[PDB]
Enzyme design. Structure first.
Site, PDB file in Angstrom:
ATOM      1  N   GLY A 117     176.766 -24.466  17.992  1.00  0.00           N
ATOM      2  CA  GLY A 117     176.550 -23.785  19.265  1.00  0.00           C
ATOM      3  C   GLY A 117     175.100 -23.723  19.702  1.00  0.00           C
ATOM      4  O   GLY A 117     174.275 -24.524  19.250  1.00  0.00           O
ATOM      5  N   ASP A 128     184.019  -9.773  21.780  1.00  0.00           N
ATOM      6  CA  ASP A 128     184.259 -11.223  21.719  1.00  0.00           C
ATOM      7  C   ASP A 128     185.585 -11.533  20.999  1.00  0.00           C
ATOM      8  O   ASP A 128     185.681 -12.512  20.253  1.00  0.00           O
ATOM      9  CB  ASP A 128     183.064 -11.956  21.061  1.00  0.00           C
ATOM     10  CG  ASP A 128     182.898 -13.422  21.444  1.00  0.00           C
ATOM     11  OD1 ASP A 128     183.712 -13.926  22.253  1.00  0.00           O
ATOM     12  OD2 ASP A 128     181.959 -14.064  20.930  1.00  0.00           O
ATOM     13  N   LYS A 170     175.829 -19.292   8.664  1.00  0.00           N
ATOM     14  CA  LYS A 170     175.396 -19.385  10.056  1.00  0.00           C
ATOM     15  C   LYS A 170     173.891 -19.682  10.033  1.00  0.00           C
ATOM     16  O   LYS A 170     173.104 -18.828   9.620  1.00  0.00           O
ATOM     17  CB  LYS A 170     175.705 -18.074  10.806  1.00  0.00           C
ATOM     18  CG  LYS A 170     175.634 -18.189  12.322  1.00  0.00           C
ATOM     19  CD  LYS A 170     175.990 -16.876  13.000  1.00  0.00           C
ATOM     20  N   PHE A 215     173.000 -21.183  19.141  1.00  0.00           N
ATOM     21  CA  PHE A 215     172.256 -20.585  18.028  1.00  0.00           C
ATOM     22  C   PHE A 215     171.765 -21.640  17.027  1.00  0.00           C
ATOM     23  O   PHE A 215     170.655 -21.525  16.507  1.00  0.00           O
ATOM     24  CB  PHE A 215     173.108 -19.507  17.318  1.00  0.00           C
ATOM     25  CG  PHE A 215     174.422 -19.987  16.737  1.00  0.00           C
ATOM     26  CD1 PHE A 215     174.513 -20.372  15.404  1.00  0.00           C
ATOM     27  CD2 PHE A 215     175.571 -20.038  17.519  1.00  0.00           C
ATOM     28  CE1 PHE A 215     175.722 -20.832  14.873  1.00  0.00           C
ATOM     29  CE2 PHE A 215     176.780 -20.493  16.986  1.00  0.00           C
ATOM     30  CZ  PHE A 215     176.848 -20.881  15.666  1.00  0.00           C
ATOM     31  N   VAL A 225     176.939 -23.926  11.938  1.00  0.00           N
ATOM     32  CA  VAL A 225     177.626 -23.226  10.849  1.00  0.00           C
ATOM     33  C   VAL A 225     178.032 -24.292   9.820  1.00  0.00           C
ATOM     34  O   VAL A 225     178.767 -25.224  10.159  1.00  0.00           O
ATOM     35  CB  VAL A 225     178.833 -22.373  11.341  1.00  0.00           C
ATOM     36  CG1 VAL A 225     179.624 -21.792  10.169  1.00  0.00           C
ATOM     37  CG2 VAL A 225     178.375 -21.258  12.277  1.00  0.00           C
ATOM     38  N   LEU A 246     180.894 -27.040   9.911  1.00  0.00           N
ATOM     39  CA  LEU A 246     182.110 -26.353  10.351  1.00  0.00           C
ATOM     40  C   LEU A 246     182.096 -26.105  11.862  1.00  0.00           C
ATOM     41  O   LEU A 246     183.063 -26.449  12.546  1.00  0.00           O
ATOM     42  CB  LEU A 246     182.307 -25.026   9.586  1.00  0.00           C
ATOM     43  CG  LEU A 246     182.428 -25.099   8.059  1.00  0.00           C
ATOM     44  CD1 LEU A 246     182.172 -23.746   7.437  1.00  0.00           C
ATOM     45  CD2 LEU A 246     183.789 -25.622   7.631  1.00  0.00           C
ATOM     46  N   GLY A 247     181.003 -25.522  12.358  1.00  0.00           N
ATOM     47  CA  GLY A 247     180.807 -25.209  13.770  1.00  0.00           C
ATOM     48  C   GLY A 247     179.397 -25.468  14.266  1.00  0.00           C
ATOM     49  O   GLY A 247     178.476 -25.654  13.465  1.00  0.00           O
TER      50      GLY A 247
END
Length: 265
Positions: free
Chosen positions: A17, A124, A38, A19, A22, A14-15
């Site tokens: 970054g 954020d 996550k 970190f 996701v 999905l995502g």
């Protein structure tokens, strides 16, 4: 804590970054529930603090946390918002009605009104962090930079100026490192602009220092095409330089509540 055997992870990312990533999945409950996981010392402490904030929150316009799991990597299991981020959805769906934008924007204000009441600072608040369950149901996500306010303090003071989304930050955040619920109101104003600009990036082609220089001159972003005057009036109201005269989430939610009900009826 959650069981790794009950949690079923999929290849669909999905995502992604700094970190890690996701990924979409589904945790076996007491009926199976679709989840967004996550997947990850600094990152581990961040995920645990992010989990503690989400556990304390209970609101229909805030992304719900299922729990935490430690296996192949440290995992934060949260509920799945099928339609995804608000900015990406509007970028792919430009034909979305103006009434539908006011509806979703008002849902974010209701969720933010709760965070103000619960004495939590988001830090954020952007269109990318607003997730859609359906086309008419929005939820607030990404509590990575979020902080639980002290009983004696109305603001959170940051020691170091780390990886920050400058374009969504209030002048007191940049100049004094002070983060209050009224600082999130400024971020909500930027979020509103992004929503009415159909997921367009705010202050395009500008650097962080240029944004600060623009706001000091009293200059604010222009009215997006098709956006009503009353909604743009609220944007500038959220963009009040002085934190004292800037409205709280209770006043912002009420202004949005009355205007959305004016459009529908």
């Amino acid at each position: 804590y959650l069981d790794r055997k009950l949690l079923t992870l999929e290849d669909k990312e999905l995502g992604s970054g700094n970190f890690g990533t996701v990924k979409k999945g589904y945790y076996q409950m007491k009926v199976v529930k679709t989840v967004a996981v996550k997947i990850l010392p600094a990152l581990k402490d961040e995920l645990l603090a992010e989990a503690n904030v989400m556990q304390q929150l209970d609101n229909p316009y805030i992304v719900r946390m299922i729990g935490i799991c430690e296996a192949e990597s440290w995992m934060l299991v949260m509920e799945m918002a099928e339609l995804g981020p608000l900015n990406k959805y509007l970028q792919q769906n430009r034909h979305v009605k103006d009434k539908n934008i006011i509806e979703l924007v008002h849902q974010v204000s209701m969720g933010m009104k709760y965070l103000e009441e619960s004495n939590f600072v988001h830090r954020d608040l952007a269109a990318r962090n607003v997730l859609l369950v359906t086309q008419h149901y929005a939820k607030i996500s990404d509590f990575g930079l979020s902080k639980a306010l002290r009983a004696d303090e109305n603001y959170y003071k940051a020691q170091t100026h780390g990886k920050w989304p400058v374009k969504w930050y209030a002048p007191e955040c940049i100049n004094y490192y002070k983060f209050s619920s009224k600082s999130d109101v400024w971020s909500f104003g930027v979020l509103m602009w992004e929503a009415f600009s159909y997921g367009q990036k705010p202050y395009r082609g500008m650097k962080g220092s240029e944004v600060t220089a623009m706001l000091e001159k009293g200059e604010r972003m222009g009215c997006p095409a098709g956006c009503p005057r009353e909604m743009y009036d609220l944007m500038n109201l959220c963009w009040t330089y002085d934190v004292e005269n800037r409205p709280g989430f209770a006043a912002v939610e009420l202004r949005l509540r009355n205007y959305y009900y004016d459009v529908v009826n």
